[PDB]
């Protein structure tokens, strides 16, 4: 279902790894010429996609990830990684492998993986 960005019962914090996810991973991807389709939730009205929200049941976007980081919603950097992988997986599910949006997602995913690989230990 659509994703919350705060939850009073859910433990939340900002570790050194979560700070790295915000200040290095998200911020690097944000300043990329191909990031703009991912700043906000997919807009099925503007794109005229009657089936998007029938097929994609766990939507995710980088704006939601940013808000989760800003709210100290996560407990672990692994949860932030989860959200990025949901974002990419959804794009690859819904779109055809040759579409412009998939090529853009693949370029961002390559940078995501490089920055995660250089994340420091907790």
């Amino acid at each position: 279902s659509m994703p919350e960005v705060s939850n009073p019962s859910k433990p939340g914090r900002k570790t050194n790894q979560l700070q790295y996810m915000q200040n290095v991973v998200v911020k690097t991807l944000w300043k990329h010429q191909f990031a703009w389709p991912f700043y906000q939730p997919v807009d099925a009205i503007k794109l005229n996609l009657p089936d998007y929200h029938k097929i994609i049941k766990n939507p995710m976007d980088m704006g939601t990830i940013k808000k989760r980081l800003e709210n100290n919603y996560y407990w672990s950097a692994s949860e932030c990684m989860q959200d990025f992988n949901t974002m990419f997986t959804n794009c690859y599910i819904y779109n055809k492998p040759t579409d412009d949006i998939v090529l853009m997602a693949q370029a961002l995913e390559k940078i995501f993986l490089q920055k995660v690989a250089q994340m420091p230990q907790e």
């Binding site: 010429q33 389709p37 794109l47 779109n95 579409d99 949006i101």
Partner: peptide, 6 residues
């Protein structure tokens, strides 16, 4: 089906 993008 999102079409052409830059």
């Amino acid at each position: 089906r999102k079409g052409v993008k830059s």
